[PDB]
Amino acid sequence: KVLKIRYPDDGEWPGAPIDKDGDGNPEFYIEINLWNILNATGFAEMTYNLTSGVLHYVQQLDNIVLRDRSNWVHGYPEIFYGNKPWNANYATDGPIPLPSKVSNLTDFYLTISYKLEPKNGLPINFAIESWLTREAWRTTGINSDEQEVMIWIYYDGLQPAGSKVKEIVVPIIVNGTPVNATFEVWKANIGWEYVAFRIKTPIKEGTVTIPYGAFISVAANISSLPNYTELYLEDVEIGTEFGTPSTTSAHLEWWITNITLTPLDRPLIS
Ligand SMILES: [Ca+2]
Ligand SMILES: [Ca+2]
């Protein structure tokens, strides 16, 4: 039927597996993940139609107070594949064997169909994220010698952490058209190493395809981390960070109607 998770009714941390064939190995995992909201009024609800495959998120939050203003954004309601290292949730029923070492993975395309409707000027992005960890099956967080990589294919009013390194051009596909797209590369120290690729021409809705290794190769190339090839690419998460400390009302709706990961016959790291 329809899988539904809701904040605050299901608790602090609503989330659920998507396990179509009931094999106890989910294909994807969804979380509302309001991880820097200490208190708010209102609600956020995510539903997944097990027939149409449509994930739909509706958020009407007000009177927001953050856990830690220095963490900047409010949360990252999302769907992911792989092992998310901040908790015991995972989804590994898919064609890409995450978690695996970067040095052992082949490249893959990530294709997402979506439509974003932030309301009232709300700062948001639509960002794909992966964590790279010393341990494949981490469930308790991230250490200072590990990495977070984000790829922002939409943003309005939000800036990545840290500082701008350079611009790169990556061949991507936008609504069926091959596009050589420019991304700004940003790098931060926030408790671990962070690298974000923020596209220069953000895409508010449609179907976007990226070659994942174009981004992980650059993140490897610019890393300050030692023994980068020891790292496991844990997962691929897709969601919307939203809000800054200026934001006390965050009303947002979106839909993601397909996620596909397509293996390629070439290494991840070029
Ligand atoms: Ca399954
Ligand atoms: Ca709003």
- Cα first-last separation, the chain: 43
Ligand 1 centre distance from Cα of residue 197 (Å): 31
Any idea where the domains of the chain sit in the sequence? 1-270
Angle of CA points 32, 138, 233, to nearest 5°: 85
Nominal resolution in Å?
1.7
Ligand 2 centre distance from Cα of residue 122 (Å): 5
Report whether 10 belongs to an annotated binding site.
no
Report whether 87 belongs to an annotated binding site.
yes
Ligand 1 centre distance from Cα of residue 23 (Å): 5
CA–chain centroid gap for 193, Å, is 16
Residues contacting 51, CB < 8 A, separation 6+: none
CA distances from 103 to 95, 170, 233, 262 (A): 17, 21, 9, 18
- Report how far residue 255's alpha carbon sits from residue 189's, in angstroms, rounded to the nearest whole number: 32
Q: Please report which ligand is nearest the Cα atom of 121.
A: 2
Report whether 23 belongs to an annotated binding site.
yes
DSSP H helices, the chain, are 212-222
Residues contacting 94, CB < 8 A, separation 6+: 27, 81, 261
Closest-CA residue to 138 (of 83, 94, 190, 76): 83
For strands 193-199 and 147-156, give the pairing. Answer: parallel
Tokens of 112: 């997402």
- Report how far residue 129's alpha carbon sits from residue 124's, in angstroms, rounded to the nearest whole number: 15
**Helix, strand or coil, per DSSP, at residue 142:** coil
Q: Please report which ligand is nearest the Cα atom of 91.
A: 1
Does CATH number 2.60.120.180 belong to domain 1-270? yes
Residues in a beta bridge with 69: none
Q: Please report which ligand is nearest the Cα atom of 90.
A: 1
- Report how far residue 113's alpha carbon sits from residue 195's, in angstroms, rounded to the nearest whole number: 24
16 C-beta neighbours (distance < 10 Å), count: 18
- Report how far residue 139's alpha carbon sits from residue 90's, in angstroms, rounded to the nearest whole number: 9
129 C-beta neighbours (distance < 10 Å), count: 22
- Compute the 3-state secondary structure of the chain and give helix, strand, coil in percent, each to the nearest 5: 5, 55, 40
For residues 15, 19, 25, 28, the Cα torsion angle rounded to the nearest 10 degrees is -60
Q: What is the largest CA-CA distance in the chain?
A: 50
Q: Please report which ligand is nearest the Cα atom of 93.
A: 1
DSSP code of 94? Answer: S
On the 0-12 / 13-18 / 19+ scale of CB atoms within 10 A, 246 is exposed
Report whether 107 belongs to an annotated binding site.
no
Tokens of 113: 């169909």
Q: Please report which ligand is nearest the Cα atom of 17.
A: 1
Report whether 93 belongs to an annotated binding site.
yes
Query: What letter represents residue 78's amino acid?
Result: E
Report whether 68 belongs to an annotated binding site.
no
Cβ proximity of 76 and 130 under 8 Å:
no
Ligand 2 centre distance from Cα of residue 14 (Å): 21
Cβ proximity of 16 and 1 under 8 Å:
no
